[PDB]
Symmetry: C6
Subunit: 214 residues, 6 copies
């Protein structure tokens, strides 16, 4: 990653073994549960495109997801190239070239070039641009890996309301990855709780609803 040293300057630092392992293990433990995306984003704080590729290349399995991710990255990179076409020809000696999409993804750029862009004045934040594309792709994967539509999360006749609400927002977390939808919560409650929730009224907070269905 690129971070600040004790002195105040922006310098490259190796990715730490702790970071590497934490990322591999969260995917081993949780696959593409929604909380894997904020974990990715935090563990890639300050990352270069090289570091982002390292993180993704160390995922064990899930290679269909990783190919979908590559396809998303290539779509965003094409849009980048359409918005920011690069000068064709040899670049001036010693000077910074403009990054294309495959440079942002770390495929056609060197680490030194990535550092140059990310620390230039003004900077071209190629790590953050690439991370945005990766997170867009990972949100698609989350939604796809979600096993159940929110329309089908419905409270069982013996199911505690809190357990139902947990299932509902766990599912909505994934489904929304990539408003009124939350009104399904009352619609999909069981008859005893729905009767209580309807008499409660429509301005009730979730806390009020959960207390009333205790």
């Amino acid at each position: 990653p690129i971070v600040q040293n004790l002195q105040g300057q922006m310098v490259h630092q190796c990715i730490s073994p702790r970071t590497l392992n934490a990322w591999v293990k969260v995917v081993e433990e949780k696959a593409f549960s929604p909380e894997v995306i904020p974990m990715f984003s935090a563990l890639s704080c300050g990352a270069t495109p090289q570091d982002l590729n390292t993180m993704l290349n160390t995922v064990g399995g899930h290679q269909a997801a990783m190919q979908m991710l590559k396809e998303t990255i290539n779509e965003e990179a094409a849009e980048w190239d359409r918005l920011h076409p690069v000068h064709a020809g040899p670049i001036a000696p010693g000077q910074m070239r403009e990054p294309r999409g495959s440079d942002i993804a770390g495929t056609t750029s060197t680490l030194q070039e990535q550092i140059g862009w990310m620390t230039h004045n003004p900077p071209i934040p190629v790590g953050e641009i690439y991370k945005r594309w990766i997170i867009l792709g990972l949100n698609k994967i989350v939604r796809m890996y979600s096993p159940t539509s929110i329309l089908d999360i419905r409270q069982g006749p013996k199911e505690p309301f809190r357990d139902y609400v947990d299932r509902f927002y766990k599912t909505l977390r994934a489904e929304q990855a990539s408003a009124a939808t939350e009104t399904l919560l009352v619609q999909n409650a069981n008859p005893d709780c729905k009767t209580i929730l309807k008499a409660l009224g429509p301005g009730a907070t979730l806390e009020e609803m959960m207390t009333a269905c205790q």
Copy 2:
């Protein structure tokens, strides 16, 4: 988080994997037992709003509690906006804007804006303001997750007094109430709901006895 460097400057530092994992694991292990709140507050020392959202977003499960937390944050943010309204209309290009409640919550503000506020002179401590809101929400969650009411904690006939007092204060710790209200609950209930053998001993010590004296006398 924001930390001091050797030049004396306050600067951004990435949240550590150790911190991230520690928070996820405390919720895995303890759910919303009362000690989760002080652990959250300490693990979020120096946190930006971004970092606070990262910590909450990484909680596994408990999504009903997380939605309740979001509703508490929105309530506090609305009160912030009532107390500290931001003057409407475009502002001078290139200058620092004033944060509204959704800025403090990290929803409508960038990291750079959060750093700018937190290191301004004088600082606008948006991380600490948001943390206060989150802690208010967690207090509500701990009360809701508590499986026992303090009125139902009564000493068993074969129950050691220390075990009863442990249950009593475990339950009271999770209630949401001022210390004045909590300590009044103790004056009203603790001796009253001891078992007959212990209660006769405790009444003889008088209303001035310390807990140490009560526990030693019932050992």
Copy 3:
């Protein structure tokens, strides 16, 4: 805590996750065995009152003990207020106020005020004062949690002398938490060892005693 940076100045630092976890785990593993007190004192090196309250608030269970601790703190704080009463009235603009007992305990003081006291020239070491009160209370808890009086640690007829001595000083550790008492060691030995210890003489070292009863 407040510690020295690489440069030589006293600054506030966040409590580390490692410290937080170590403290919670020693209480989970050992409850109020005597060695928990020196572990507390070392893990709270440099602590502010805020940090000390953090450490205590993260203890799982043992809430009767924690209430006893609060009562001890309030007694010491009252004694503080009796010895160091604070000026009544508004304090001069920009100047340091005097801490009362509830300020030392972190209840009515801010972190910034705690830092100010602890780094002032001369300092008011409110972290160390509060830690003394906490350790006084924890020593009371240790003694109370001790299951057996030292008078009742008596060597069994088949019990190796070393195992007995281990039980004796384990118990004395807790009982003394808050001289001649150690002469109980010979008094409470079994007949075969007592016969050997008495013939050894009264100046014997523990090593000499243990060797002789091997």
Copy 4:
């Protein structure tokens, strides 16, 4: 490894126990699954040739693979010597010599010589050159350890499409081939070797469908 200090200088630092253990454990856990290569490259960030040899020498078992690695290194070192021959004959006493391939591999060079090359102005990045050789050797090993050929990955009649695509790209990941060759293999095989029900759905999407569209359609 070589790292920057506060005076801005590049200086040697000892390899950490955490790094050493992380590498030994990834080989223990994953053997030569493809992700071992990116993990090796990241854990050897800033490595000298000495450090690279330390990492390889600490691998437990897999000594046939390690001997194959040494043979690849010797092949690359010979090509280095053909492209960049070192002028024969004694050189000026006290001056920096030019590295030959066995110097880059850490066999005939001292640590001090490696530091000298890596921090020279301009640098001779012998750690990065050796690492490239090692990665070429590991690519060969991963292909050899792969238990399946991409031609034998065919969807089972009861196999979820996502599980089949996972197997397909797990296998393709281990093959040693340009991305052009690998993606041609996909165009030639992935739909062709789907099971009848999935294949009829995929053919109807057309050759332009994305993998997301294919996987969603076969769910």
Copy 5:
């Protein structure tokens, strides 16, 4: 402990949780096997007397050994006071006092006094002096905890020579004796107490054979 900072000054640093835990765990795992002593000495690198007491006080159990340690410390402290008596009578207010044995042991000295002595110019290394006393006490404890005497280590009839030599030097390592005495024990016992088949082979090598030659010959 006392450590160097960037300004070149020796300054106090808090004992780390990692150090604390490492020491408690080595005693949990190994009790007073001989390697506990070098581990104690290394983990107490730079320690003040306060830190040394912290380490000892955190040992779980083994309180007979801990009391023996205190008695050894008091013996050494008394010898310190005989060799380096502190002039009696009040001293100049505000100046550094001289440490007596109980000051070195951390009992009658403050942390500030310990820092003052250890960083004085010239230093009075009270941490190192106390550590020497503790190590003398631990040497006694290791000898006492050893379950075997070197006279009772004799090779079994089916016992590999290497296993016998391992037992022999494990036992000798725990004895409390100069290296001269220990190596004389080896010359007197090791070959003598080998089993008949090994003993005939070892006698033929002669009294000049190395242990490597003895072990290779009896393999």
Copy 6:
């Protein structure tokens, strides 16, 4: 160890608990498998003779090996003393003395003297000299602990060639610790693989051999 601080100067640092534990655990897990030697050498980066003695004194068991190591060290130290005899007599006040072999081994030198030698201009690298002697001794131990001669690693009739090659080079690793020997690999292969390897020809790489015997 002696290492560089953030500022660029060579200073003594305590051995870390992590290093201490890693070394003890690799010997617990692997005894004297060949990879223990490169692990030792890396974990002792920058070590003083004191630190090297610490590392060896913390090995659990294997005390016959450790005595063999001491005997190797004493042989190398005697050779040192023969090559670099020290001045007999009192050394000049305030000046550096010359190390003898037992000084290099940490037996008759203080830590301060070790630091002085290792940081002098020019330096006497007593840590590295001692480490060389230790590694010479550890290589002897590896070879001795190896259970099987390379002459006796022979492929079974049903044994996969890769598994045989693994056994062969695992054994050669240890045997060589302290060229044509690798031609035993074809000699010691089973009849089916030997037939294939001989028809392959004599210039084949190991990769070619392993592929052909798949």
